With several copies, the nearest count.
Chain A
Amino acid sequence: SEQVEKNKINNRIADKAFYQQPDADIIXXXXXXXXXXXXXXXXXXXXXXXXXXXXXXXXXX
């Protein structure tokens, strides 16, 4: 009951795309965060504006 119930919950907090995946990433470094920072990337790469470009170049060094 509860487990199969806990089961569906995933694929449910903004559909296994940055929800359950984020949970797995919580359970490179960042570093790795900076990478998944190049990150976000919607409408048009949604990133290189400020934080994205910044961290990117910084680390790249």
Chain B
Amino acid sequence: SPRLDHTRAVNYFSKVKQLPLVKPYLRSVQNHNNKSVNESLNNLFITEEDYQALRTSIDAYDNFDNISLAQRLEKHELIEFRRIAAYLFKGNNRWKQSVELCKKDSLYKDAMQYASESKDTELAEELLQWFLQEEKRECFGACLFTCYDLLRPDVVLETAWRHNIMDFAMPYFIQVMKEYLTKVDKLDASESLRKEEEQATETQ
């Protein structure tokens, strides 16, 4: 352990077709954050089908090629990695994961949750505009959008009309913002009166 360079080892294993013996050799190790470790280590958890470890195998040590790695995963059939390659590519960057969907990997599930944390607001119109032409859970769509402050303005609430006379009734949220914009109004009128009132004592 102590007083090896590791960098000059995994190399002799890889071009050996026998590197996995070192599987556990990578156990107590991998604290070194070394590349050859994660790098093939992932390659290992990939062809081996390991996700628990692989996920945790990177739930801390971030030393690797955050790219091609998810390239071999997407080429899979077993979504486990087509699900994480989805994550791996997104990684603390939500824009990738969504802007890369289509029919497949369009899960009526996580797709309604990975948008929320976003910041590129308008992408809501992107997603939503799409919900309309290709899906029907637009309800949960045009809604989970709204409730988070407001990133779904008038602009989007209408974009949907130009089209759907029928289809729109749902609201949970539109009112959440209503008395919200009726409560901030409460405290505001309150401080207005604050002012009024004081300007009444020192100078009635």
What 0/1 readout, one digit per residue, does chain A (1-24) give for beta carbons within 8 Å of chain B? 001001100100000100011001
B13 beta carbon closer than 8 Å to chain A: no
B67 beta carbon closer than 8 Å to chain A: no
Which of chain B's residues has its CB closest to A6's CB? Answer: B49
The A-B contact count (CB < 8 A) is 46
- 8 A-B pairs in the complex with CB atoms less than 8 angstroms apart: A16-B79, A21-B107, A21-B109, A27-B55, A35-B112, A38-B144, A41-B140, A48-B162
> A35 and B113: CB pair below 8 A?
yes
What 0/1 readout, one digit per residue, does chain A (21-61) give for beta carbons within 8 Å of chain B? 10011011000100110100100010010000100110111
User: Once bound together, how far apart are the Cα atoms of A57 and B156, in whole Å?
Assistant: 11
Residues of B within 8 A of A (CB): 48-49, 51-52, 55, 78-80, 83, 107, 109-110, 112-113, 116, 137, 139-140, 143-144, 147, 155, 158, 162, 172-173, 176
> B176 and A61: CB pair below 8 A?
yes
Name the distance in Å between A29's Cβ and chain B's nearest Cβ.
11
Contacts A3-B49, A28-B116, A38-B144 given; indicate if A60 touches B109 (C-beta within 8 A). Answer: no
Name the distance in Å between B136's Cβ and chain A's nearest Cβ.
10
